[model samples]
Target: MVDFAFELRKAQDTGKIVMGARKSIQYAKMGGAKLIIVARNARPDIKEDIEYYARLSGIPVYEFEGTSVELGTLLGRPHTVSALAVVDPGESAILALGG
Candidate 1:
């Protein structure tokens, strides 16, 4: 399997990602979210909705084993992130993540 943080960083640096729960859900609803990364500590309601929409839209959701703070750190952000959407993989193989 590909390294989680490694590929996440690669995708962040090389590709486009939508941060936060609202944008992720919006993107997933539009069927533009190729993949979604959800923090283990994400809110129950938000997490459920994100997964539900992702499933309905045919987007792969990657469950991050770490906390939202750690996920934010991995993505080089200063704040915690509940859910993030990947619109493009760019030079990374993040699409191979949940497969």
Candidate 2:
């Protein structure tokens, strides 16, 4: 869990990351996303769709250990983020965390 947060912070600074469920879904469908992370408190239906699209696009989906609020806080955002897609992992080595 600590590793996830550390990687996330590094990724935010050095990686190509897209936030929000709608954009993440599109990225996944287009195979533009390498990894997807969804907050544990995300809406069930949206989470399901994200997982489905990620699987189809051969991208991995990971359920974040924290809630949406915590995720947003970690990302340094004032609003909650239900999901985020990593287009490029950069120097974070976030991909090593697994799905």
Candidate 3:
């Protein structure tokens, strides 16, 4: 299993924090999203919102089994209820450096 707190802190240090499905969806729409990671145990409404937005934008969505706290820790921010790994294809160096 991935270490929730560690991964998130690492992401933050490298600047990969994208909190909440709303912003994730928005980023996906903007063509900067590489992956959407949704918590399996999130609020149904939030999950559904993510699904609908992903479908509308045709972005790939991945799921993990965990609570909101689990997701937050995994994303490296207590404020991150949900998140996406935004990928700007034009800026390969930026994405590579983010990891």
Candidate 4:
């Protein structure tokens, strides 16, 4: 399995990533989104919000198996990050999440 936490941190440091539900939704609508990662703890309604726009934008959701807080830790942040968009994976090997 891919080291999800390591890849996330690498993406944050080397690649381009955007956090927050609003940003994810906005980015999904505005395009330039490669991957959308949503924490499992996030509300279903919230997931639907981003997923809706993501579908139209041709982006796929990662659907993280952990909680928002755990995701936040992986990102090296104290605040919870319910959703995020990976505009560029850079050096991180995250594109094979489902495959």
Candidate 5:
């Protein structure tokens, strides 16, 4: 399994990642996201909307097994992040998530 937490932190430092469900949804609609990661504890309606738009835009979506708290911790943020858009993976190799 990929070490998502490590990769996410690395990506945050070196690449472009947008956090939050609403922003992620906007990114998905614009085809600006290469990949979308969602926490297991994300709100259902938002998750569904993100997946639907991401699918239509041909953006790959990854379901994170961790909760929002764990995801926030990985991102080194106090606020919970229910969804995040990976615009660039940098050296993290997070793009492999699509495979």
Candidate 6:
């Protein structure tokens, strides 16, 4: 099931959010992340990379519907076009979203 509550917390600052598989992975590699949420519908490559880094770094990862539009709405920002990465985990609450 999708966790809307968690999604909401992650979406609070959608402005800094980065969508798409490559970008998300890049951000995580840069070591600027509190959590990584992989969309249920994310592409095979995207999902795999996100899961890989998330597990390696021991960061929290959430998965839900990967709809760009719905994701944008729930995130409370413009259409993400892809994925998101929290710049600062400390600044964001650990809310889980329903998919």
Which numbered prediction scores highest in TM-score against the true structure? 1
Give the TM-scores of the predictions, in the order they appear. Answer: 0.96, 0.94, 0.61, 0.93, 0.95, 0.64
Report lDDT (CA) for all predictions: 0.91, 0.91, 0.60, 0.88, 0.92, 0.60
The TM-score of candidate 4 is 0.93
lDDT by residue (tens digit), candidate 6, 1-99: 434556355455442455566777887777665566666666778778887886677656777555666666666667554466665543434433311
Alpha-carbon runs more than 4 Å astray in model 5: none
Error of 3 at 84 (Å): 3.6
Model 6 root mean square deviation, Cα atoms: 4.3
Ten-residue region with minimum lDDT total, candidate 1:
89-98
Where does model 1 exceed 4 Å of error? none
List pairs with backbone clashes in candidate 4.
Answer: none
Model 5: weakest 10-residue lDDT segment is 1-10
lDDT of 3 by residue, 1-99 (tens): 445445445555655546677777777667567556677776678777777776777666666667767777655456646545544333223233223
Model 5 over residues 1-99: C-alpha lDDT tens digits?
778778888888899999999899999999999999999989999999999999999999999999999999888899898999999887887878988
Q: Residue 3 of candidate 6: its Cα lDDT?
A: 46
Pairs of colliding residues, candidate 3: 8-76
Tens-digit lDDT track of model 2 for 29-72: 99998889999999999999999999897898989989999999
Candidate 4 stretches with Cα past 4 Å from truth are: none
The per-prediction tally of clashing pairs is 0, 0, 1, 0, 0, 15
Candidate 6 wrongly placed segments (more than 4 Å): 1-11, 14-16, 76-80, 89-92, 95-99
